[PDB]
Ligand binder design. Structure first.
Ligand code: ZN
Length: 176
């Protein structure tokens, strides 16, 4: 278990490679997190007799493309296979917890919350109410305690990491 670790920025193409050795006509397949890969360009070429390289192309990486990839061959036996590559996709923060819309009575207290993650880490959050910075910058997860509102009000989180900024959905708190 010595995986290679490949880090790519969101939206960039990437190509992964594996080596398969010790077998004439291996049936090679790319696997991601233990599942046979679908809907990606796969290429398997011979450099010598008994020496093959597998090639997996991704056109424009998103978060869901991150995972552990490797090549497997059926039967295999003494076939030597390259170690897995761990694909990590870096970019601006992603909100795992969005702020929720609420209906509240006037001057009644409430709490909103949001969570955002990288990579890269760490992530900090600021809260906006209308166009006014309230809370933060503070780490994730973030909560916002509000004493009350007297009219419909918008709240959103803005998350920050090395790669830049992401906004949450805008929550609306309306009067019941
Ligand atoms: Zn910064």
């Amino acid at each position: 278990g010595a995986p290679v670790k490949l880090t790519v920025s969101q939206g960039q193409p990437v190509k992964l490679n594996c080596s398969v050795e010790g077998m004439e006509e291996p049936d090679i397949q790319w696997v991601k997190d233990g599942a046979v890969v679908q809907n990606l360009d796969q290429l398997y070429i011979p450099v010598s007799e008994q020496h093959w390289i597998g090639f997996l192309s991704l056109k424009s990486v998103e978060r869901s493309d991150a995972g552990r990839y490797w090549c497997q061959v059926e039967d295999g036996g003494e076939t030597e296979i390259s170690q897995p590559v761990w694909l990590t996709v870096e970019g601006v923060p992603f909100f795992t917890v969005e702020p929720k819309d609420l209906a509240v009575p006037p001057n009644a207290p409430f709490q909103l919350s949001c969570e955002a993650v990288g990579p890269p880490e760490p992530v900090t959050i600021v809260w906006w109410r209308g166009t006014t910075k309230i809370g933060g910058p503070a780490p994730s997860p973030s909560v916002l305690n509000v004493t009350g509102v007297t009219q419909s009000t918008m709240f959103s989180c803005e998350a920050h990491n090395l790669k830049g900024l992401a906004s949450s959905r805008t929550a609306t708190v309306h009067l019941q």
